[PDB]
């Protein structure tokens, strides 16, 4: 579980979205594990513009926060699942470090801002959705 709270936009895992979400949709893409749904109230993250490689992810299921290296964001074999079937997943950043399924949507930061979300795991290896190239987030 968890979302990016900026302006009026909420941002989820599309595996992770409710009917909320999809009643007030404002873009989605299956490929990136990305949705973008509307609020009502004003969100106070700051996304991060940058080319940044290391920075700071939440893990839910070791109730911590970690240091990581990350890719840059790429196209990156995802097995199939009870959401998507077997794919190529684009804009994903890997790195070493602890995840779990229920790990989804914890925010990746770096000294910039928002990063991304917890999307891909396993084998001792953590997977982030990017959203720095998402610009009309802020505006
Ligand atoms: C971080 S979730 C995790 C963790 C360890 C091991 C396995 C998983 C499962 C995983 O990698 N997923 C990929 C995600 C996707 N972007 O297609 C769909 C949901 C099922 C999540
Ligand atoms: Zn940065």
């Excluded at 700051?46 to 109730?63: E, H, K, L, M, N």
């Amino acid at each position: 579980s968890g979302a990016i709270y900026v302006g009026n936009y909420r941002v989820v895992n599309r595996h992770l979205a409710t009917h909320n979400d999809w009643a007030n949709l404002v873009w989605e893409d299956s490929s990136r594990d990305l949705l973008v749904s509307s609020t009502t109230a004003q969100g106070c993250d700051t996304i991060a513009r940058c080319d940044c490689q290391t920075g700071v992810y939440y893990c839910s299921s070791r109730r911590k926060h970690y240091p990581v290296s990350f890719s840059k964001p790429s196209l990156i074999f995802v097995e199939a699942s009870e959401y998507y079937p077997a794919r190529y997943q684009s804009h994903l950043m890997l790195a070493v470090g602890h995840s779990e399924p229920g790990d989804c949507g914890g925010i990746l930061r770096c000294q910039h801002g928002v990063v991304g979300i917890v999307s891909t795991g396993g084998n001792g290896l953590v997977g982030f959705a990017d959203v720095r190239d998402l610009l009309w987030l802020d505006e």
